[PDB]
Design a protein around this ligand. Structure first.
Ligand SMILES: Nc1ncnc2c1ncn2[C@@H]1O[C@H](COP(=O)(O)OP(=O)(O)OP(=O)(O)O)[C@@H](O)[C@H]1O
Ligand SMILES: [Mg+2]
Lengths: 340, 308
């Protein structure tokens, strides 16, 4: 209702109720042409004053002031109703998700370099939310709010219990969150995944990074780690979805080994746009690797939404996440993040 | 020229269905209702056969909020007494909270859901909380509910009851009916029902898990649904299960004396043992291997809905 309100006050007309498709994601979104024949993407974050909307705007204010020479791009904010939580953007034409690109074999080394340049640029400061991001949610490692249990599958609850009962993992996560108080922080997405990227022109155009609801001043290791962890997850689960546990690990290990160039590509793109990232931050690769480890638990728990049982591929993947989180220094070297 | 004659020691329904099933010598090819299934080893056919058997013999062939409301509104009780060791108490001006190690997870429960003792005890001390009986997300595809009465200490044996259901509308009424019946008989149960409208019809659109003594609850659910069988349910049922009415079947959770090879769902368990025995024949009659296979999985070959 307020969508057309806003779309009209913006010179855009109203959206054809048909031809207006809807993408995925928790928030409501509408895409397609308006009656003035202009293509829009509309997102709605319903309020009670949403911090997510403010953070999404904190970004579109920066992105509006970026030269065309920038590896970092946003599609373009046409307007916004802060009061009712509506945001209008230029629709990217024939946009394919980075998650579809990944599964189809088309998220190659060149596109991983693009992504790294974009993320390197982002990381090179008022207006920004400075609150700690709740990822990982540390109090959930002690105890899940009962409300949250009633929105989780049996497999999600079982994953959380595995985490909760693993004292070494819980403690590694605490140390990782404490370093965030004592390191060079930087503008950061804080919710990065293949499906937070889109490529224009059916995967032949420019690369966009979207969903800035978590945009903060935070540990840049969050974004590097998240992207490494997307590949770790893909290599040891998404590609493999009654074998033995040893057979599942060996298969997954080989798959990982073969997907490592993707992470090295990203890291080279990152260092191209931010060569002095380690100047005062020598722990960045190690921390990135820890976040990659956690990212695997994060994706496992999310994919387990639609499961009653935690299958043995899930469990083997989880085992690799624990090796990376508890051994971040070695994982940085093997993932290619120690490169100079 | 008779199925029981050529397949002895086997429940008739089963011996009949083994006529639609062939496994070639070598164990790399098999036919299941004139659908062929192909593999590159025995071991790989074991898996593809189990799936083909499971689909033809046991099964055949979103979370709409409206339905969920309709399904949620059909529940008698609202709460179930759940035990667990207390960890910690959290004083808050917003409202106090108990950190409790439940058996499935450690959780943060408002302290106003305590029931025994009524005064939060020391950490480690067992406590009994009052938690929602409706869990709509716990079983993907399914709205799910637990009995108002605490299940037995070890849970022990479990009686499943499958109710075919043509559609949402069918399910709503069968749901309300079955739960109505089950609380009146005071059954020690859990239960669930498809919450996705475009996923019906299904032999297991409703499942009910019954502990300790199932007769009262079974007798009770039978009578409540007699009226509807055929029209609101569908006729046909799993070949592994004991029919009680059109669309209404039942059976026991799998008890299995072999380690590693155990802890499956009832359908997949049987289909697995069945596919195993068929496979073991082809590596050279047939019904003797099938029957032996069933007995190693702790299945009664005469009464496959039951265990040894
Ligand atoms: N301007 C745009 N043009 C084309 N596609 C877009 C555009 N903005 C977003 N999308 C696509 O629509 C999807 C949904 O948007 P977005 O990720 O912002 O939603 P969300 O509700 O915040 O999801 P979640 O929080 O679950 O990630 C994006 O992941 C992306 O694939
Ligand atoms: Mg998204």
């Amino acid at each position: 209702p307020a969508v057309n309100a806003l779309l009209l006050r913006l010179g855009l007309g109203r959206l054809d109720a048909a031809a207006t498709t809807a993408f995925g994601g928790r928030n409501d979104n509408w895409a397609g042409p308006t009656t003035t024949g202009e293509q829009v993407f509309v997102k709605t974050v319903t309020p009670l004053g949403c911090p997510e909307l403010d953070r999404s705007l904190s970004f579109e204010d920066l992105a509006a002031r970026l030269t065309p020479a920038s590896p970092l791009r946003s599609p373009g904010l046409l307007g916004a109703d802060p009061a009712a939580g509506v945001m209008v953007h230029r629709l990217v034409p024939g946009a394919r998700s980075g998650a579809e690109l990944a599964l189809d074999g088309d998220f190659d080394d060149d596109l991983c370099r693009s992504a790294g340049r974009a993320v390197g640029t982002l990381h090179g400061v008022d207006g920004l939310d400075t609150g700690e991001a709740p990822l990982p949610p540390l109090s959930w490692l002690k105890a899940l709010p009962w409300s949250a249990v009633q929105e989780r599958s049996m497999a999600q609850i079982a994953a959380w219990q595995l985490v909760q009962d693993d004292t070494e993992v819980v403690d590694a996560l605490h140390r990782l969150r404490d370093l965030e108080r004592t390191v060079p922080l930087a503008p950061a997405h804080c919710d990065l995944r293949f499906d937070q990227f889109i490529r224009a022109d059916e995967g032949a155009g420019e690369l966009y990074l979207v969903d800035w609801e978590e945009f903060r001043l935070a540990d840049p290791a969050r974004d590097v780690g998240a992207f490494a962890g997307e590949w770790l997850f893909h290599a040891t689960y998404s590609v493999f979805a009654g074998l033995t546990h040893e057979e599942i690990v060996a298969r997954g290990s080989a798959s990982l080994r073969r997907h490592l160039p993707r992470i090295a590509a990203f890291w080279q793109g990152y260092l191209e746009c931010r060569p002095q990232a380690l100047a005062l931050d020598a722990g960045l690769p190690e921390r990135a690797a820890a976040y990659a480890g956690w990212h695997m638990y994060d994706r496992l728990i999310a994919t387990a939404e639609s499961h009653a049982t935690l299958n043995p591929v899930a469990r083997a993947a989880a085992g690799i996440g624990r090796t990376v989180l508890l051994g971040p220094s070695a994982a940085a070297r093997t993932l290619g993040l120690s490169a100079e | 020229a008779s199925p029981v004659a050529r397949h002895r020691g086997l429940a008739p329904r089963l011996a009949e269905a083994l006529d639609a099933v062939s496994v070639a010598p070598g164990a790399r090819r098999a036919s299941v209702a004139g659908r062929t299934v192909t593999a590159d080893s025995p071991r790989d056919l074991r898996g593809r056969l189990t799936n083909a058997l499971y689909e033809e013999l046991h099964a055949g062939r979103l979370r709409d909020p409206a339905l969920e409301a309709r399904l949620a509104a059909a529940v008698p009780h609202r709460t179930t007494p759940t035990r667990g060791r207390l960890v910690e108490v959290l004083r808050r001006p917003d409202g106090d909270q108990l950190v409790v190690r439940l058996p499935e997870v450690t959780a943060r429960v408002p302290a106003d859901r305590l029931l025994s003792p009524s005064v939060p005890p020391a950490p480690g001390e067992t406590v009994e909380l009052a938690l929602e009986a409706a869990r709509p997300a716990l079983s993907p595809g399914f709205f799910y509910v637990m009995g108002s009465r605490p299940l037995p200490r070890p849970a022990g044996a479990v009686r499943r009851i499958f109710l075919h259901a043509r559609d949402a509308d069918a399910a709503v009424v069968l749901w309300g009916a079955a739960l109505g019946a089950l609380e009146e008989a005071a059954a020690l149960y859990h239960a669930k029902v498809l919450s996705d409208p475009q996923d019906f019809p299904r032999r297991d659109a409703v499942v009910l898990y019954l502990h300790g003594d199932h007769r009262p609850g079974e007798r009770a659910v039978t009578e409540a649904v007699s009226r509807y069988a055929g029209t609101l349910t569908g006729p046909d049922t799993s070949v592994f299960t004991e029919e009680l009415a059109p669309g209404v079947a039942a059976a026991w959770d799998p008890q299995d004396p072999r380690p590693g090879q155990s802890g499956m769902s009832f359908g997949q368990h049987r289909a697995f043992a069945l596919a195993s025995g068929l496979i073991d024949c082809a590596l050279a009659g047939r019904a003797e291997h099938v029957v032996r296979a069933l007995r190693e999985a702790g299945i009664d070959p005469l009464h496959p809905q039951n265990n040894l």
